[PDB]
Design an enzyme around this catalytic site. Structure first.
Site, PDB file in Angstrom:
ATOM      1  CD  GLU B 334      14.532  40.932 -11.139  1.00 20.42           C
ATOM      2  OE1 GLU B 334      14.094  42.158 -10.962  1.00 20.42           O
ATOM      3  OE2 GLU B 334      14.289  40.347 -12.140  1.00 20.42           O
ATOM      4  CD1 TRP B 356      16.014  36.877 -12.920  1.00 19.46           C
ATOM      5  CD2 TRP B 356      16.034  36.709 -15.040  1.00 19.46           C
ATOM      6  NE1 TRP B 356      16.121  38.190 -13.430  1.00 19.46           N
ATOM      7  CE2 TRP B 356      15.773  38.032 -14.689  1.00 19.46           C
ATOM      8  CE3 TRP B 356      15.838  36.078 -16.324  1.00 19.46           C
ATOM      9  CZ2 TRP B 356      15.845  38.867 -15.836  1.00 19.46           C
ATOM     10  CZ3 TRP B 356      15.683  37.055 -17.452  1.00 19.46           C
ATOM     11  CH2 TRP B 356      15.834  38.418 -17.140  1.00 19.46           C
ATOM     12  CE1 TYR B 382      14.935  41.680 -17.741  1.00 20.29           C
ATOM     13  CE2 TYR B 382      13.991  43.721 -18.049  1.00 20.29           C
ATOM     14  CZ  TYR B 382      13.634  42.685 -18.341  1.00 20.29           C
ATOM     15  OH  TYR B 382      12.421  42.312 -18.564  1.00 20.29           O
ATOM     16  CB  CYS B 442       9.326  42.925 -18.969  1.00 16.94           C
ATOM     17  SG  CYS B 442       7.850  42.366 -19.713  1.00 16.94           S
ATOM     18  NE  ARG B 463       9.092  43.137 -24.081  1.00 17.96           N
ATOM     19  CZ  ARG B 463       8.286  42.056 -24.127  1.00 17.96           C
ATOM     20  NH1 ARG B 463       7.082  42.170 -24.259  1.00 17.96           N
ATOM     21  NH2 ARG B 463       9.023  41.366 -23.268  1.00 17.96           N
ATOM     22  CG  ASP B 466       0.962  38.355 -15.254  1.00 18.23           C
ATOM     23  OD1 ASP B 466      -0.115  38.297 -15.136  1.00 18.23           O
ATOM     24  OD2 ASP B 466       2.016  37.524 -14.792  1.00 18.23           O
TER      25      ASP B 466
END
Ligand SMILES: NC(=O)C1=CN([C@@H]2O[C@H](COP(=O)(O)OP(=O)(O)OC[C@H]3O[C@@H](n4cnc5c(N)ncnc54)[C@H](OP(=O)(O)O)[C@@H]3O)[C@@H](O)[C@H]2O)C=CC1
Ligand SMILES: NC(=O)C1=CN([C@@H]2O[C@H](COP(=O)(O)OP(=O)(O)OC[C@H]3O[C@@H](n4cnc5c(N)ncnc54)[C@H](OP(=O)(O)O)[C@@H]3O)[C@@H](O)[C@H]2O)C=CC1
Ligand SMILES: Nc1nc(N)c(-c2cccc(Cl)c2)c(CCOCCCOc2ccccc2)n1
Ligand SMILES: Nc1nc(N)c(-c2cccc(Cl)c2)c(CCOCCCOc2ccccc2)n1
Ligand SMILES: O=c1ccn([C@H]2C[C@H](O)[C@@H](COP(=O)(O)O)O2)c(=O)[nH]1
Ligand SMILES: O=c1ccn([C@H]2C[C@H](O)[C@@H](COP(=O)(O)O)O2)c(=O)[nH]1
Lengths: 562, 559
Positions: B334, B356, B382, B442, B463, B466
C-alpha cells in the site's frame, strides 16, 4: 506541640471582606476545600476522638449564621475580649459529640489552651480569620503553612489580609528593584521564640499551585505557601528485590543521559513548587524541556533556535480560560485576528487599523516582493488562513474581491456537523492548502484543527501547528484556539471542555533564552474567565463582534526584565 | 546468604552457542549490559573491596578469548573436573586487586565456597553459562532472577539453554504446548531446601522488558524474570503532609471512580515497561478504562478518547508490533502504491493485499454517490494527494504527471537542500476532493524534521484511530515511509511520532483485547533496505528491496 496553619481566600489586593461578610459570590469549591482541610484528621490525609481546631476572631464568628456556627466537627476557639463562653453555649442546643466552643483573650491564649487542655484530643490548629488573627498569627510566627485561595477578581473590600513576605504570589510587586522603601509587611519570625531579630526573618514560599477553578463567575485557585527562611541568597514502587534486580539495568541504560544532565544546569520552572497542578506548568515545563533537551539548529530567519519535534499540551475550558499568566498575552490581537479569520479576510490593513500590527511586517511591499508577489497590494496576505477556512481551494485575485460561495467553507461544515452529527470523526478544518502556498504571504503555522464531542455535550478541539515559537507565538495560539472553542461551542449548544495543542517543530530562539529563564521564575496566577457577552444575540459564528467578550479576572505578571 | 542470578543471551529457540562460541555477530550493548550488571555492586545500583562473582562451566571458560579471560573485576569460578586452579593462574597471572580464579567440582561446591570463604567480599553471584551450569542452577532453585538478552533471530546453535518454566517469554508455545513441559522443563524448586516436591514448584515471570536494541544486524532486547511460585497462576514530611488533605479532596472524585472500575492493565507484573509496544498496550487499556462509549456511523459501539500520542524509535529496530502479527505485506505494498500516485485498488488486490477491496465495491461506491467510479477506484485519495495535490481527478487510469502539487517531491527536495525548513509537510486532507473519494483520508498529514545529526523524524496526524485493528498497521506504514525517505536523502531514521485525534476501540473487540493485553511484547524486528546503491529516488524502491529480520510475533487471539 501542634501544627498551626492559616486558611483564607483573598482577592489579588488581599481583600477578604466587606461589611462583615465575604466580598464575592459563594465559591462552592472553596467552601468544600475549607471543610476538607479543617475537618481532616492528619491520619486520613494519606488514606478516643481526635479532631482539629479552628480559631477565629469575634467578628469572623459573628459573621456566621447561627445554623452554621460553631463549625461542625472541629473545636471552635473564638478570640474575643467580650464574648462569653456561656452565651455561645446558650445560642443553640448543643449537638452530641460536638465540642464546647471556647473563648480566649488572645491568640497566644488560644494556642496555649489547645496545647495543654486539648493535648491528647486536638491534631491540627487552623487560623480561619479575620485580619486581626491573621496579623496576630503572622507576627507571632506560629503558622507553618498558609492555605490561600487566590481569588483572581477584585471586589470592593474594607478588610484586607496583612501584607506579608510571599504576597507577590497574589499580584505584581512594583518593587522590581525599583522600590520606594522596603516593601511594608508584618515581620514573620522564622523561629517564633526568637522574635524580630534581623537573622530571624521568614518568608512564605509557594509549594503547591492548583489548576484554576471557578464558581458564580469568579475564577480562583488554591495555593499552599510554606514558611521558609527569607534566605534571599538569590536576592511506581515494587518489591525490594524486584527493584534491586532492575537497578543495574536502569543504571547503564541511563549512562548516556545522566552524563549530559550533570554537564549542564537543568532548567526548571519555579523548582520549589512540588505539586504543579496549575495548567500553565505544561507551558513552563515545555520551555525548560526545550532549553534542556532540544537541539540547537539553524532556521529561516537566521536568528537560530533550539528545537524539539512533537510536543503536546491540553487546557481545560470548563472553568477558566488558558490565557497565560507568566507573561501577559496580547488579548486584543487574539480576538481581532480570530474574528478576521472567521470573516475570511485577507486584508491585514483591517487589523493594522485596529492596533493589531501582527501581520504588518509580512505584508510590506518589500516582503511581498521577497515572495515574488509584486502584484500584491500592501496588506494582502494572499489566500491565507481565513481564506482557506471559509473558501478552501477557491481561486484568489485580491483582498478586495468578494469570494462568497467560492471554495469549501470548512467552518460552516464543522459547525453543521456538530449541530447534527457530533460523533463524526471528520470534523476538521485545514488552512494547509499546498496548491496555494506560493500565493500566500506566509505559509500557515497553525494548519489543522479537529473537534470532538463526548457523551455529555462537552466539546474538545485539537490544533496541529508545524512551527511553534514557544516564547512569543504559542501563548497567542493557545488563546486563539481556546477562544475558537468557546465560540464554536456556544453557537452549537455544546459546553467547552478542552483545547489540545499538537506541536510540530517546537522551538525557542536563542535570543530569548535569557528572558525565558527569567519568565520561568514566575509562578503562574489563576487563569481568567472569558465570558461570551450577549449570548442570546449570537446565533451563528459570524454574529460574534469584538465587543462580545470580557476577560474577567486576568492578573498576569508584567514585563520581562530583558 | 548471597543472591544468585543467571545471565544469558539466547535466540527464541533457547540457543546459546555453536562450536564453543557465540552463535551471532558481536552484540555491543549486550556486552555493555553484561559487564555493567555483573560488575555493579549494589552500592552503585541503588545509588575492604567488594566484588561480585561470575560462575561458569569449563567450556564457557575455554570459549572466552584469552584477552577477556578471566572476566576482569569479578571473582571468576569455573565448575570443572579437569581444570586446575594452578594452571589457570599460570596462564595470565593476576593483576593486583584482581581475584584468584577458583575452580570447583560442582555448583553446590562453588556456591558454598562463595558463602563461606567470600562471605565478606562477594555481593552478588551470577551464573554466566553455559548449558551445564544453567541447568544445575535452575534445578537447584537458587536463582532468584534470570537476566535474558532475547536475541530476536534464530542462529544455528549446538548448545541450548534448558527448557524452563517461563520460557513462553521467548516464542509461541503450540508445537509443545503444556504437556511436553514436565518431560522437557527443569523442575525449579521455589525453596531450594525442599527440593522437588509437588508444592515446591516455581516459575520465572517477567518483571522488566526493555526497548529493542540492535547491533551488526541483530535485534534484541533485555528482560528480567523473577522466581515466583507456580500457584499464583490459575519532598519534606511537612511539605507532603501540608499538601495531602488538599490532594485528598481533589482526588475525591477520581479515587471513587477508580474504586468502582476494575482496571484493565497490560501484563501488570512487568514493572519496568521500557518496550515501546507498551504505549500501544497502555493506550488500549487507557481507552477501555477511561474512554466514553457512544455508538457510531454503523451503530457498532465505540469507546473513545481524543488526543493521544505515541513515539517509536527507528534507529535500532522497526516498530512492527509483536502482541499481534501485523500485515507487513499490506503495509509495504500500500505504501508503494501510495508513493506511485496510484489510486487503483485492484493493483493491490492482484498482489494479495485485499484491505481496500471492501471500500471499492460497486455497492460501496454507490453509497458514496459515486456511481461513475470504476470498481477499484479510490478516487483522488491518499497517493493522489501526496503527488498531485489539487489536481482534477478523472479516474485511476489517467496519467497525472505534472498536475497538482507533488508534495513528496518537495519534501525530499527540501530535506536534501534546506533540512532545517519547517514547512516540510505532506497532506492528503484536501477538503475540495473529499467527496470525490471513497474514504476521507485517515492519516491526513505528516511532517518531517532533521536535527543536527542527519537524523530524520516524522509526525503523522490521524483523525480516527481504530487502536485494535488499524493503528499497528498505520505505525508500520509511516515508519517504513521514514526509512525510505531517510535513505534517499542520505539521512538516518530517528523517530516516528503518532499524533492521534479521535482514538477508539470498538466494544466487541474489548474481550479479545483483554486477551492480547495478557501477552508480553517480543523484541522488535529489524527492517532492512537491500540494494541501497541502486536506490536513488523514492520511486526506485520495489517490494523486493526490503527484508524483515527477526519478526517473532504472538499468534492469533482465541477470542
Ligand atoms: N475571606 C476569608 O477567608 C475570611 C474573611 N473574613 C472576613 O474578614 C472580616 C473579619 O475580619 P476582622 O474584621 O478583622 O474581625 P476578626 O474576625 O479579626 O475579629 C475581630 C475581633 O476579634 C478579636 N480579636 C481579633 N484580633 C485579636 C487579637 N490580635 N487579639 C485579641 N483579640 C482579637 C477582637 O474581638 P473583641 O473586640 O471582642 O476583643 C476583635 O475586635 C469579615 O468581613 C469576614 O467576612 C473572616 C474570616 C476569613
Ligand atoms: N549466549 C550465552 O549467553 C552463553 C553462551 N555460551 C555458549 O554455550 C556453550 C558452552 O556451554 P556448554 O557447551 O554447556 O559447556 P559449559 O560451559 O556448560 O561447561 C561444561 C563443562 O563444565 C563442567 N560442568 C557443567 N555443568 C556441571 C555440573 N552440573 N557439575 C559439574 N561440572 C559441570 C564440566 O566440565 P568437566 O568436563 O571439566 O567437568 C562440563 O564438561 C558454548 O557454545 C558457549 O559459547 C556460554 C555461556 C553463555
Ligand atoms: N479558603 C477559605 N478560608 C476561609 N477562612 C474561609 C472563611 C470565610 C469566613 C468565615 C470563616 Cl470561619 C471561614 C473560606 C470561606 C469558606 O468558609 C467556610 C467556613 C465558614 O462558613 C461560613 C458560613 C456562612 C458565613 C461565613 C462563613 N474559605
Ligand atoms: N547476556 C549475556 N550473557 C552471557 N552469559 C554472556 C556470555 C557469553 C559467553 C561467555 C560468558 Cl562468560 C558470558 C553474554 C556475552 C557477553 O559476555 C561478555 C563476557 C564474555 O566476553 C566474551 C567475549 C568473546 C567471547 C566469549 C565471551 N551476554
Ligand atoms: O501563529 C503562529 C505563527 C507563527 N509562529 C512562529 C513560529 C516560527 O518562529 C515563525 C514561523 O516561520 P516558519 O515556520 O515559516 O519558518 O513564526 C507561531 O508560533 N505562531
Ligand atoms: O488508515 C486507517 C484507516 C481507517 N482506520 C479506522 C479508524 C476508524 O475506526 C475507521 C475510519 O472510519 P471513519 O474515521 O471514517 O469514521 O477506520 C484506521 O485506523 N486507519
Amino acid at each position: 506541640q501542634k501544627p498551626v496553619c492559616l486558611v483564607v481566600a483573598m482577592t489579588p489586593k488581599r481583600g477578604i471582606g466587606i461589611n462583615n461578610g465575604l466580598p464575592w459570590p459563594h465559591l462552592t469549591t472553596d467552601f468544600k476545600h475549607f471543610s476538607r482541610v479543617t475537618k481532616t484528621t492528619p491520619e486520613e490525609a494519606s488514606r478516643g476522638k481526635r479532631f482539629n481546631a479552628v480559631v477565629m476572631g469575634r467578628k469572623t464568628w459573628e459573621s456566621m449564621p447561627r445554623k452554621f456556627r460553631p463549625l461542625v466537627d472541629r473545636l471552635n476557639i473564638v478570640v474575643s475580649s467580650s464574648l462569653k463562653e456561656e452565651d455561645i453555649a446558650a445560642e443553640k442546643p448543643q449537638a452530641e459529640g460536638q465540642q464546647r466552643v471556647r473563648v480566649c483573650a488572645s491568640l497566644p491564649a488560644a494556642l496555649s489552651l489547645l496545647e495543654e487542655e486539648y493535648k491528647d484530643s486536638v491534631d491540627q490548629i487552623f487560623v480561619v480569620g479575620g485580619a486581626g488573627l491573621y496579623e496576630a498569627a503572622l507576627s507571632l510566627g506560629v503558622a507553618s503553612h498558609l492555605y490561600i485561595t487566590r481569588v483572581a477578581r477584585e471586589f470592593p473590600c474594607d478588610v484586607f489580609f496583612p501584607a506579608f513576605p510571599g504576597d507577590d504570589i497574589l499580584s505584581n510587586k512594583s518593587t522590581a528593584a525599583q522600590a520606594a522603601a522596603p516593601a511594608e509587611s508584618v515581620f514573620v519570625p522564622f523561629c517564633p521564640e526568637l522574635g524580630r531579630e534581623k537573622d530571624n526573618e521568614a518568608t512564605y514560599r509557594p509549594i503547591f499551585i492548583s489548576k484554576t477553578f471557578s464558581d458564580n463567575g469568579v475564577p480562583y485557585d488554591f495555593v499552599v505557601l510554606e514558611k521558609r527562611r527569607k534566605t534571599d541568597d538569590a536576592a511506581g514502587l515494587q518489591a525490594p528485590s524486584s527493584a534491586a534486580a532492575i537497578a543495574p539495568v536502569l543504571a547503564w541504560m541511563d549512562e548516556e543521559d545522566r552524563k549530559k544532565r550533570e554537564q549542564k544546569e537543568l532548567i526548571r520552572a519555579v523548582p520549589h513548587v512540588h505539586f504543579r497542578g496549575h495548567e500553565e506548568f505544561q507551558y513552563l515545563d515545555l520551555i525548560a524541556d526545550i532549553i534542556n533537551n532540544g537541539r540547537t539548529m539553524d532556521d529561516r530567519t537566521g536568528v537560530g533556535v533550539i528545537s524539539k519535534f512533537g510536543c503536546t499540551m491540553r487546557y481545560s475550558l470548563d472553568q477558566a480560560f488558558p490565557l497565560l499568566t507568566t507573561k501577559r498575552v496580547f488579548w486584543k490581537g487574539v480576538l481581532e485576528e480570530l474574528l478576521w479569520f472567521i470573516r475570511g479576510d485577507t486584508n491585514a490593513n483591517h487589523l493594522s487599523e485596529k492596533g493589531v500590527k501582527i501581520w504588518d511586517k509580512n505584508v510590506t511591499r518589500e516582503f511581498l516582493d521577497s515572495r515574488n508577489l509584486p502584484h500584491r497590494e500592501v496588506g494582502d496576505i494572499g489566500p491565507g488562513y481565513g481564506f482557506q477556512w471559509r473558501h478552501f481551494g477557491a481561486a484568489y485575485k485580491d483582498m478586495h474581491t468578494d469570494y462568497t460561495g467560492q471554495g469549501v467553507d470548512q467552518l460552516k461544515n464543522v459547525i453543521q456537523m456538530l449541530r447534527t452529527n457530533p460523533t463524526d470523526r471528520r470534523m476538521l478544518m485545514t488552512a494547509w492548502n499546498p496548491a496555494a502556498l506560493d500565493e500566500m504571504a506566509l505559509p500557515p503555522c497553525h494548519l489543522l484543527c479537529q473537534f470532538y464531542v463526548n457523551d455529555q455535550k462537552e466539546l474538545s478541539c485539537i490544533m496541529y501547528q508545524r512551527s511553534c515559537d514557544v516564547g512569543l507565538g504559542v501563548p497567542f495560539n493557545i488563546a486563539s484556539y481556546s477562544l475558537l472553542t468557546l465560540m464554536v461551542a456556544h453557537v452549537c449548544n455544546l459546553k467547552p471542555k478542552e483545547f489540545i495543542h499538537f506541536m510540530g517543530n517546537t522551538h525557542v530562539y536563542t535570543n530569548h533564552v535569557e528572558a525565558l529563564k527569567e519568565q520561568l521564575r514566575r509562578e503562574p496566577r489563576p487563569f481568567p474567565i472569558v465570558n461570551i457577552l450577549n449570548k442570546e444575540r449570537i446565533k451563528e459564528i459570524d454574529d460574534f463582534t469584538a465587543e462580545d467578550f470580557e476577560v474577567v479576572g486576568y492578573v498576569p505578571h508584567g514585563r520581562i526584565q530583558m
